Amino acid sequence: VVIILTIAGNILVIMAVSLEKKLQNATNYFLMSLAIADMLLGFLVMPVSMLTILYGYRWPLPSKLCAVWIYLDVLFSTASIMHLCAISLDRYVAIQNPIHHSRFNSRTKAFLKIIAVWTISVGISMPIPVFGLQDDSKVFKEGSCLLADDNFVLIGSFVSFFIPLTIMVITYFLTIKSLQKISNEQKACKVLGIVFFLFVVMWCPFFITNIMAVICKESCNEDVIGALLNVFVWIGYLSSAVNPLVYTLFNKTYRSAFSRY
Numbered sequence: 053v054v055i056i057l058t059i060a061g062n063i064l065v066i067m068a069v070s071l072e073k074k075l076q077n078a079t080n081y082f083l084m085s086l087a088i089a090d091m092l093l094g095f096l097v098m099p100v101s102m103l104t105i106l107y108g109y110r111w112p113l114p115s116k117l118c119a120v121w122i123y124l125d126v127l128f129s130t131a132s133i134m135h136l137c138a139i140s141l142d143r144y145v146a147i148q149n150p151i152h153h154s155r156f157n158s159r160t161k162a163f164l165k166i167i168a169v170w171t172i173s174v175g176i177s178m179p180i181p182v183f184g185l186q187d188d189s190k191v192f193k194e195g196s197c198l199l200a201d202d203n204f205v206l207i208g209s210f211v212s213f214f215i216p217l218t219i220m221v222i223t224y225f226l227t228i229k230s231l232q233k234i235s236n237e238q239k240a241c242k243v244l245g246i247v248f249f250l251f252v253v254m255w256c257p258f259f260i261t262n263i264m265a266v267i268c269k270e271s272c273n274e275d276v277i278g279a280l281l282n283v284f285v286w287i288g289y290l291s292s293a294v295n296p297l298v299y300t301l302f303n304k305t306y307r308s309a310f311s312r313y
């Protein structure tokens with residue numbers, strides 16, 4: 053059911069930009085690209101995880117395909133985090149300095165920000181396909197599909213998520229501070245706050261459990277950590293479905309487009 057919503061919401065978002073040409077602004081191209089990453093993640097990755105859940109957490113799929121699956125789950129997931137990080141940076145720049153942002157608000161730089169995000173997503177996720185496909189034990193370890201290089205993993209989870217997280221946590225808070233510096237401004241503070249709170253609460257638990265697992269493997273119980281990771285990956289996947297409904301709620305035209313289709 054999470055997979056259905058995750059696919060469907062992004063599918064509606066991507067068409068609504070095309071079917072309704074009013075949302076041809078530069079921002080909604082970023083928003084449709086984030087929807088693309090989320091829908092791709094829902095289509096390619098998540099039913100496989102549901103299948104492993106049914107089959108007992110053993111990888112029925114061909115052996116080397118396990119290597120690319122994890123790679124997809126890094127690239128599509130890292131892209132969404134980088135999309136939201138760039139959204140936070142650009143929206144903070146818009147709030148703090150609205151006039152000067154309009155001078156450089158041309159779409160030509162907006163496309164460079166897209167190429168930057170989708171380039172950094174590949175740059176972060178380079179090792180997993182080539183290394184995992186070469187050595188099964190690196191990414192197929194324990195008989196269940198899992199990425200198992202501690203040295204690479206603990207830094208990779210950090211740069212991919214925490215570095216955007218501090219950029220989000222230092223920009224979002226500052227965006228509220230700019231609004232504070234009446235009713236028009238303060239209404240944005242709460243709506244920004246809920247969006248920040250959900251994605252932090254839904255993304256962060258997986259990563260802290262992963263880093264806690266790698267560091268504390270000597271001093272922790274494996275089974276509880278495994279169950280927690282099994283559920284927290286689902287919650288992180290729900291993070292993908294979350295954003296289209298947020299789009300539906302605050303914007304008039306997306307709501308009309310989804311009501312029609």
Ligand SMILES: C#CCOc1ccccc1CNCCc1cc(OC)c(N(C)C)cc1OC
Pocket residue numbers: 093122125126128129130132133199205208209210212213254255256258259262284285287288289290291292
């Ligand atoms: C958005 C979204 C997807 O949902 C989410 C959302 C948040 C957390 C987890 C999930 C579940 N996806 C897991 C993806 C993933 C990302 C990684 O960092 C970028 C890494 N490491 C570098 C260790 C491993 C990994 O799992 C293979």
